[PDB]
């Protein structure tokens, strides 16, 4: 599917240079961050998408994911599937976990404060998470299919919003640098 949403968001510490490419292609390098999140997808994401990717360079140097990424509201929940990571695989309230696309992936739960958020600079939320129990190889074609994460966060009391915000396929990073290059559809 076409992309029609480009993430390109730095919390203004250090360098990120994103590049919004052809079609649903973008890359990020980046270097000495505070907080960042680009990537490609959908203005308005949805529990039902199907998400599919090549990252062809998966290089970070230090903390940085690659990852479905997305919003609701209604209530807000900030929301991750996690396929490959740095130096740093992120955790939390241990849920549960599910079998998606050839994946186990770790069903987390976390909560951030005075944070930045789609309604503001300084926001209290709960972050949801499958977090891939190996990481993802990268390079070939991938498949997110999302409504197993969805369903699987519900059968544990993790629900979402009604109000569905975008939806991309991203790299963040915190506190490294890096590069990637991530194709999405």
Same mark, same amino acid.
């Given at each position: 599917?076409?992309? @029609?949403? =480009?993430?390109?968001?730095?919390?203004? *510490?250090?360098?990120?240079?994103? !590049?919004?490419?052809? /079609? &649903?292609? +973008?890359?990020?390098?980046?270097?000495?961050?505070?907080?960042?999140?680009?990537?490609?997808?959908?203005?308005?994401?949805?529990?039902?998408?199907?998400?599919?990717?090549?990252?062809?360079?998966?290089?970070?140097?230090?903390?940085?994911?690659?990852?479905?990424?997305?919003?609701?509201?209604?209530?807000?929940?900030?929301?991750?599937?996690? @396929?490959? =990571?740095?130096?740093?695989?992120?955790? *939390?309230?241990?849920?549960?976990? !599910?079998?998606?696309? /050839? &994946?186990? +992936?770790?069903?987390?739960?976390?909560?951030?404060?005075?944070?930045?958020?789609?309604?503001?600079?300084?926001?209290?939320?709960?972050?949801?998470?499958?977090?891939?129990?190996?990481?993802?190889?990268?390079?070939?074609?991938?498949?997110?299919?999302?409504?197993?994460?969805?369903?699987?966060?519900?059968?544990?009391?993790?629900?979402?919003?009604?109000? =569905?915000?975008?939806?991309?396929?991203?790299?963040?990073?915190?506190?490294?640098?890096?590069?990637?290059?991530?194709?999405?559809?």
């Amino acid at each position: 599917a076409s992309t @029609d949403y =480009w993430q390109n968001w730095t919390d203004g *510490g250090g360098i990120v240079n994103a !590049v919004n490419g052809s /079609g &649903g292609n +973008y890359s990020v390098n980046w270097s000495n961050t505070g907080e960042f999140v680009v990537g490609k997808g959908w203005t308005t994401g949805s529990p039902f998408r199907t998400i599919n990717y090549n990252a062809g360079v998966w290089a970070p140097n230090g903390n940085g994911y690659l990852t479905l990424y997305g919003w609701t509201r209604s209530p807000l929940i900030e929301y991750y599937v996690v @396929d490959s =990571w740095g130096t740093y695989r992120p955790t *939390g309230t241990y849920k549960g976990t !599910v079998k998606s696309d /050839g &994946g186990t +992936y770790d069903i987390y739960t976390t909560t951030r404060y005075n944070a930045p958020s789609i309604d503001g600079d300084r926001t209290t939320f709960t972050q949801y998470w499958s977090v891939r129990q190996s990481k993802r190889p990268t390079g070939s074609n991938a498949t997110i299919t999302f409504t197993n994460h969805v369903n699987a966060w519900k059968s544990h009391g993790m629900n979402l919003g009604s109000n =569905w915000a975008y939806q991309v396929m991203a790299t963040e990073g915190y506190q490294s640098s890096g590069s990637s290059n991530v194709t999405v559809w």
